[PDB]
Amino acid sequence: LPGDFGPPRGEPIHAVLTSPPLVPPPVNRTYPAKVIVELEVVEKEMQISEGVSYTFWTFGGTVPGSFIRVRQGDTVEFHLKNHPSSKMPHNIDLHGVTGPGGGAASSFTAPGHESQFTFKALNEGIYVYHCATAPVGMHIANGMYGLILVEPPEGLPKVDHEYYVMQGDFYTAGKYREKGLQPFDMEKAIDERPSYVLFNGAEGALTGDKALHAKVGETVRIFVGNGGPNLVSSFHVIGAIFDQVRYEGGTNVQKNVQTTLIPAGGAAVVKFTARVPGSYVLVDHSIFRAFNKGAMAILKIDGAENKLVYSGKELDSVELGDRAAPNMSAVTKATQASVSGTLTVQDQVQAGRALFAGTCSVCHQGNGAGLPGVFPPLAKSDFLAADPKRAMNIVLHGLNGKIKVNGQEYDSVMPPMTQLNDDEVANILTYVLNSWDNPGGRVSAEDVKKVRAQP
Amino acid sequence: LPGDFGPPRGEPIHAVLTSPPLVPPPVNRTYPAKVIVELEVVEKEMQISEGVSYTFWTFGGTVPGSFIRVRQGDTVEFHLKNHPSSKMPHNIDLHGVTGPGGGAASSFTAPGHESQFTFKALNEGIYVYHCATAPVGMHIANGMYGLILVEPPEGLPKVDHEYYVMQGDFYTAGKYREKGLQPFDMEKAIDERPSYVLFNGAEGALTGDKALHAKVGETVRIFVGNGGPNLVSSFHVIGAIFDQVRYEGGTNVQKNVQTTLIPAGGAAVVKFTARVPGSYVLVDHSIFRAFNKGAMAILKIDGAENKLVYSGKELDSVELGDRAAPNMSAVTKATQASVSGTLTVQDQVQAGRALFAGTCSVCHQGNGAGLPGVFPPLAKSDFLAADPKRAMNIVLHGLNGKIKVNGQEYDSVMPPMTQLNDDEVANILTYVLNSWDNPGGRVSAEDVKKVRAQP
């Protein structure tokens, strides 16, 4: 057989698993071992977006699940526990396992139980693991996937950083950024029409203050999975190139590519060398996923600029939108205050401030000044103040034709923004009204609901 | 030119074509030949699913069409007949043909006619062939695709088994498993929203008693096509690895991968070595296709277990659902009896038995016992017997909150199952009522239609 390094030697090893985006250290071992893996399924509510809860089903309490790292030829004794608070039964299929279901029929586990099975890791590579419990699509859609690395016997070449990034498509009853606890939507899942496409199980999981880091001159290896369930990732790094891309345990290694297709259920190891400082964006280049459904992660490189290689500036809200900023915690706070019935004007203003970035600032500027004759001002805007109800209709339904703002004529087009939720329009407009010497007061989600219902 | 082995020699050869999932024997020849291919288009109703008929358009009476096997450098004299019962005209485009339309403009054939054209097979490889008659998408969607192998002059390396598997997406007016003769749906086809995604033209075409077979230690080569028309396959083998994947006649060979993307209209040769016994599942790992639309095929390996490689069990209904069992012939029978107006309680019970597997058994068990305090029993269930109408609402619309069943409290969640058709809910519940000392009687499709219409 391949990976035939004889029976386990040394002492049994209790595998150290890591939560995303971190990876366990290299096994750093010259002999095959008995590796004991203990993984516990937890079902739990987490925020899939600010003020949006979802009941995830997880391996080890995270999406993706805990990272497993073994050596080709190891004997893996796999213990799957299902937490007693679980409502569903669960199991595991590991890609790279030689045997039926990749472990599925020997890991079937009711709430409060444990199952175990043993496999030899014959196949070197990076592999997806996921739940394989009927209905399989529902279990995977809820977050039940992760990566197992089977190292080659000599180990992978040393790098400065190893990170763990996994794409998933998600199906909520509600629309993108519609607030509240969102049920799984089986109709959207069967139709392959996700409301969110994410890295590491949430909007902003790898942006702002949760960006991945490295320094100019350092090597980064990223273990990249695609849990699906349904989508194929046009996986891409903005502003850089992959030194290498290797799929699963394939003999083929592609070098010097920027855009690579990762199948649903697929995985790849990519290598990046940091050359110049700034934010390097990992996306699904099926662009509405990256820029309208959440599929953007950041590798932030710190170090000296090299003007001979790139003379230009770090990214801002023009490219990264409301994910340029460290976090949108103000949106979470305002959503919680709406639920409690304690929502203040200032709660709305700080939420609107976070949401205004990119969404409105690309044309009206971060300071609401616009560009005289080209983009009208929101700062001290006579037009805004004259009719707050018209302002709600402009965000929902757009505006075109000649207008006069602060003594100047505009003859341009503001596209409609009907995909903004009622709370988002209300918070953005309350921010604008309470900024730049505008008249203050507030716009409520309920105000916007009535305007949406009759344009 | 490539494949320049001079003029045909020896005797003209009448090509032996095979129906899926079988392949013609290796050409086993050292000289180029004149190969005469005779292929006849037949339009005909076949079962796309149990009790679901569809009018397929076929090359040779099967989906995919008859497998053609020639040698690089052969002169192929291609005869396309259109059966006189056909309503549409048809033609053929073979990938790997050097010339306009791959044969399309010289193979255009009205019902009851024959066309012929000659081509030299310059290009070694595995290639899709399909109909290229306006509207091309409708002809391909109805089943008009297959494979032609152009062998290299020295032939392919010998293996124990060669099989023929081809994925297709299908567009019915009705929903998945909605019974009756289903028309082609052009709106779903243009939208790329298939109701079925299949191997070899039907649900269960390669599962249960129609699984592919091999023995521990044997090599299997699978000629894998993707007829589309629209989908890209994340083609994957559960519990195993491909020794090799080679696309069309590409110089590139990928080795040691589990998950590979097959383009719409693409084809690949994969090689598998059987290591341990059990069912190895070929899927489109765009998981709702594999587990909700029919895209699952089985390679069943018989032979000695190796507990050093895999300690675990063969797959069952937890993973393969209602395709674990040899066949669902009882569903076909019950559908026929509904049409005839002769549907008996026992017809419903045997259909419901087949459908209960995985769909209900994953939580309630194959024997309806459930798991005390975790999954309530369907066996001798006081709760079921108290209100059969409530049971219909529970399958369609789900159940949550505290209930008491056979003296025990449950506080859990049964997801809704509204994608089940009225006949499916009726048959499953009639099976349950007539099992495990439950009260008997029956639930009709019409009973379920009324409950669906007002939750």
Added chain:
Amino acid sequence: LPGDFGPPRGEPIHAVLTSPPLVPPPVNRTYPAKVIVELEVVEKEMQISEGVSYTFWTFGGTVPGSFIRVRQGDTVEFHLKNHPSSKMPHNIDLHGVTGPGGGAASSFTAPGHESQFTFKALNEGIYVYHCATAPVGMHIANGMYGLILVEPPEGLPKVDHEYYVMQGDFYTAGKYREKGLQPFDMEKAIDERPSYVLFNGAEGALTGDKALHAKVGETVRIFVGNGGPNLVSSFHVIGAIFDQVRYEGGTNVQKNVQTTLIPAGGAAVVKFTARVPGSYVLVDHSIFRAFNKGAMAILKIDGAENKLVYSGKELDSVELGDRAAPNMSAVTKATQASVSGTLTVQDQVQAGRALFAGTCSVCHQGNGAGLPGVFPPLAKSDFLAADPKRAMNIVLHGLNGKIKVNGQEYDSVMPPMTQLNDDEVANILTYVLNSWDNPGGRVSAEDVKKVRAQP
């Protein structure tokens, strides 16, 4: 660093950019240079289909944008101008640029402004460039993408022809071929449900009198991009094979393939050797894109037939439909005449003539003769003349069952063609009525609207 050929030498070079489908000449240079690129964003209405206008956003006035050609190790001084008639701000992200946003944060440009940034071209290859202005998906969907080639220092091998072909998916408020100025549809874009999938920004951009050309024996290199925003191309050449496919600046080169997957935002260089004359069709083999949404381009090879390689005929309307003919200018004319209120019977007849090809001729023949007993005649048809209103219902809703036409019984099936627009049915039927000794008169779009509204 890679591409470390020292500082720029010689004179600064003003890059010569080309409009699709042409490519600038090889740089033909042994030293690294300072290359000045000047690219101007223009927003403008163009015909996305005959009689269908769309407001495109373009780099250099075309979709795809102007082709840029530099050498690995060049210092590129990039000048982006935004035309003063623009309503939106714009920027550029070039794949293959080493630095944040690929130029995005240093190229942000309001209407009537200019931005500049400098980069070293470290990475050899073919690369997509696109707008990266919030909302990024809307800018790319409107046409803001093109290719930059970074040549290897020794240059690419010489070929007879170099062409520029770029796929895009497009989202109109109206359905496919619905006439008038079509707004961008954000709902369809987010759902990844394009109304058009095109090469070079229009239906027929590379068909008929706009086909690419070469001669038997000549080599063709095609720089193939996929601007997306959302779709992955099953990129395929009908009737031929690619000698080579190379993605971006990848070390991997695939040889001898017919079907290759291009990611959203991806690019590839393909090489084709012309062997036999005729039309070679470039498609997205996700077949409803190629044959129902516009994703078909033609490489027309002129030269001597070789009956030893391919005995068959050039393509016609059976395969290429209404794109076999040089152009459909008559449809543009009839649409303009409807807007003006000057629409004549002859305007309708010539538009219907263009649309009848393939759509109706595949079964009824180019001369309306049909095939006695199999396809009924439209030529001198007693059945057509007896009830023009029934003829409208037959095109929209199909026809089956026994009929008698010109003394012969037919018992067959004409599929419904409800995806035809009201003007298309009206023009086709007016063409038929004014041909082949039929009674004349006309059918109006308004006649068809009333029949569609009550079958």
